[PDB]
A = this chain, B = another copy of it.
Amino acid sequence: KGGRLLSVLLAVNVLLLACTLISGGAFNDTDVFALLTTMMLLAALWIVFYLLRTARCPDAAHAGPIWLRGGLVLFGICTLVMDVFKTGYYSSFFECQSAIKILHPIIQAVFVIVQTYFLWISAKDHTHLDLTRCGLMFTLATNLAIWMAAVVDESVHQAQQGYFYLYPFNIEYSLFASTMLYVMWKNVGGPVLGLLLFVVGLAVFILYGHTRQALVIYYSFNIVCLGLMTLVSLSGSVIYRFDRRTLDVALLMGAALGQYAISYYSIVAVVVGSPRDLQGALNLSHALLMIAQHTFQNVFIIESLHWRRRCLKDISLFLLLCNVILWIMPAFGARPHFSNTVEVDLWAAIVNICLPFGIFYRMHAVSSLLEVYVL
């Protein structure tokens, strides 16, 4: 109402202007970086304004769980490293007069630091409601603009001193910061089975020209990973009948779209291509199990958030480490993986949009499972 409604119009207009200019390169345009820098400083200038204006603010579950801030800080450090490498390679290829190109790393780092500190300190459950509402939503647009900026950049990344140390963790940072700003804007007025999966999950990462068996080892572990989660979550779904947070549900269901799309694109490619090798069947089973475990785990968490009881503790403990080993490969891995052969045929654009949502989903899942385990 009023300023609250006006802020969204300001947010979408900044976003829509950015989104149009994000795809400037495909139109056959480096002016996007200048726009990206401009919104970063102004958002940062509001943050530093707020960091001293927060004294005026008569502040006051709702404060935001620890995992949010932890992931925020971690991915902020990752963005710091990313922009350090960026400015390093820019200074290595120092020739063009354009400065916005080298300013974007520095301004991005400054923005990351100030936003991280501000979100860390003020996430706890005021005054200047007109400016703050227009301030938080403007910062929301900046995170989404740089997110879609990075998505396009790595999508077209295919085809000297930076050693191509690309870190898509900035995308994960933008989503983590966006939800943290969202919640603040809303209040303006024997489980040892998972342990064995840690070693084998890391061993294949250490292990990974590839052999036919190497694909099987990677897929078989993944298949038995989701296959176990498909039935323990189903086991958790049937035991809840014995013992019978809007944004949490939206984030859980919403982030699941990332894994749904890649799996659905995988099964479509598998059936259309109709391969005869075991690789196609492995892909089909892996994607189907991914979708099934995602749906069942989502239902389990949604129902949960609304001796004997130790049974549900073990599976939640089991899925806790099982999810973590499922997050290592996306966070640290290769998007054009050898696992997908018929899908890459390049589909990296689909992977870039989708994988961070799965990474986002994993962090929400483990925190939710930990939340009900201690309860």
Binding site for B on A (CB under 8 A): 1, 5-6, 8-9, 12-13, 16-17, 19-21, 24, 27, 29, 31, 249, 253, 257, 260-261, 264-265, 268-269, 272, 291, 295, 298-299, 302, 306
Q: Is the CB of A31 within 8 A of B272?
A: yes
CB-defined contacts of A1 to chain B, threshold 8 Å = 306
With A1-B306, A29-B272, A268-B24 known to touch, is A257 a contact of B9 (CB < 8 Å)?
no
How far is A29 from B269 in the complex, measured between Cα atoms in Å? 11
CB-defined contacts of A17 to chain B, threshold 8 Å = 264, 268
Q: Is the CB of A260 within 8 A of B298?
A: no
Jot down 11 A-B pairs with beta carbons below 8 A, ordered by A: A8-B253, A12-B260, A13-B260, A13-B295, A16-B261, A16-B264, A17-B268, A19-B261, A20-B265, A24-B268, A27-B269
Shortest 7 CB-CB distances between A and B: which pairs? Answer: A20-B264, A16-B260, A20-B265, A16-B264, A20-B268, A17-B264, A9-B295
Q: Which of B16, B257, B265 lies in contact with A12, CB distance below 8 A?
A: B257
Q: Is the CB of A298 within 8 A of B253?
A: no
How far is A29 from B272 in the complex, measured between Cα atoms in Å? 9
How far is A16 from B306 in the complex, measured between Cα atoms in Å? 27
Minimum CB distance partner of A268 in chain B: B20
How far is A144 from B295 in the complex, measured between Cα atoms in Å? 21
Q: Which residue, A24, A249, A253, A260, has most C-beta atoms of chain B within 10 A?
A: A260
CB-defined contacts of A269 to chain B, threshold 8 Å = 27
CB-defined contacts of A19 to chain B, threshold 8 Å = 261, 264
How far is A106 from B268 in the complex, measured between Cα atoms in Å? 26
Q: Is the CB of A268 within 8 A of B6?
A: no
CB-defined contacts of A295 to chain B, threshold 8 Å = 9, 13
With A272-B29, A291-B13, A295-B9 known to touch, is A20 a contact of B302 (CB < 8 Å)?
no
Tell me the smallest distance from the CB of A137 to a CB of chain B, in Å.
Answer: 13
Tell me the smallest distance from the CB of A88 to a CB of chain B, in Å.
Answer: 30
CB-defined contacts of A253 to chain B, threshold 8 Å = 8-9, 12
How far is A176 from B271 in the complex, measured between Cα atoms in Å? 34
CB-defined contacts of A8 to chain B, threshold 8 Å = 253
Tell me the smallest distance from the CB of A253 to a CB of chain B, in Å.
Answer: 7
Q: Is the CB of A268 within 8 A of B21?
A: yes
Q: Is the CB of B257 within 8 A of A16?
A: yes
Q: Is the CB of B264 within 8 A of A5?
A: no
How far is A21 from B270 in the complex, measured between Cα atoms in Å? 12
Q: Which of B20, B29, B291, B299 lies in contact with A5, CB distance below 8 A?
A: B299
How far is A253 from B253 in the complex, measured between Cα atoms in Å? 23
